[PDB]
Amino acid sequence: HHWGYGKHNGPEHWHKDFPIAKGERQSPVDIDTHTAKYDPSLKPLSVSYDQATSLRILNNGHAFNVEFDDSQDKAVLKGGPLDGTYRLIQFHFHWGSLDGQGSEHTVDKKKYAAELHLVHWNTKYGDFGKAVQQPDGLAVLGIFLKVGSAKPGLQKVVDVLDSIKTKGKSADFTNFDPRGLLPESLDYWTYPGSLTTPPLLECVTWIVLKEPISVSSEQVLKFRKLNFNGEGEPEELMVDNWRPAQPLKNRQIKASFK
Ligand SMILES: CC(C)c1ccccc1-c1ccc(S(N)(=O)=O)cc1
Numbered sequence: 001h002h003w004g005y006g007k008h009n010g011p012e013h014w015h016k017d018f019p020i021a022k023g024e025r026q027s028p029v030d031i032d033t034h035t036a037k038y039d040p041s042l043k044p045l046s047v048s049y050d051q052a053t054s055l056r057i058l059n060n061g062h063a064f065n066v067e068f069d070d071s072q073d074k075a076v077l078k079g080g081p082l083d084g085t086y087r088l089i090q091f092h093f094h095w096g097s098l099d100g101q102g103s104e105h106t107v108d109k110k111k112y113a114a115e116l117h118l119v120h121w122n123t124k125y126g127d128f129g130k131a132v133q134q135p136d137g138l139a140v141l142g143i144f145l146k147v148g149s150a151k152p153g154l155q156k157v158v159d160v161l162d163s164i165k166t167k168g169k170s171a172d173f174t175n176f177d178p179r180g181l182l183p184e185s186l187d188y189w190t191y192p193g194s195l196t197t198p199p200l201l202e203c204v205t206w207i208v209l210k211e212p213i214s215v216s217s218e219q220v221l222k223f224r225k226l227n228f229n230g231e232g233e234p235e236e237l238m239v240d241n242w243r244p245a246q247p248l249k250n251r252q253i254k255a256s257f258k
Pocket residue numbers: 090117119132140194195196197198199
């Protein structure tokens with residue numbers, strides 16, 4: 001009886017195995033655009049993905065992860081609210097069963113169709129496992145998806161999904177360029193928070209881009225063909241793998257833009 005997103009093991013149940021679920025800096029949150037304050041001391045974000053080395057794509061039973069070689073400073077996030085250098089380790093998405101839901105963060109209570117998480121760890125902690133034990137261990141770049149025009153840079157991901165339909169399946173996934181997943185503007189909101197899946201550790205500086213990317217209906221439909229179950233199990237479509245907004249508590253969301 002492990003955690004998931006079903007009727008009986010979903011977000012409202014997680015606190016029983018992971019008490020930090022009701023903690024002081026949990027994610028995601030609703031971004032109230034009128035209450036977020038412009039912080040003129042925030043730097044432009046530095047996204048350096050030109051040397052990114054993707055390796056593999058994995059269905060882990062709750063999302064799919066596109067994994068990167070993070071044994072050197074090849075793809076890094078710096079600047080913005082961050083001190084130091086954060087290495088890209090993986091990206092994944094959260095999405096809905098319908099276009100009206102799927103994102104984890106919300107913007108004035110608006111839910112997007114999906115949300116991309118580019119996960120980075122602080123190199124001062126040496127590796128990912130140590131980093132998640134630190135309050136400034138991770139930087140996650142969050143990007144909203146809306147349904148409209150196709151995102152050409154997403155298509156290579158969409159097309160490999162039939163090869164990783166079920167839990168525990170992986171496929172080689174080299175030479176994927178995550179720059180093709182970025183919107184034009186790097187304007188962002190930022191706040192201190194947590195992993196949005198168990199173990200829900202409070203180790204994340206969240207940087208959520210204001211500008212969503214557009215993906216096509218066909219692209220998101222292919223996400224919804226994935227399975228939470230393993231091969232040879234009853235099919236449970238991988239949809240609605242998002243945690244809802246959590247209480248903001250004693251936190252201020254800062255904006256990089258006026
Ligand atoms: C399960 C978690 C510790 C983990 C392990 C290995 C690689 C990635 C992650 C991880 C899981 C979720 C997130 S998230 N949803 O971006 O907050 C970010 C990172």
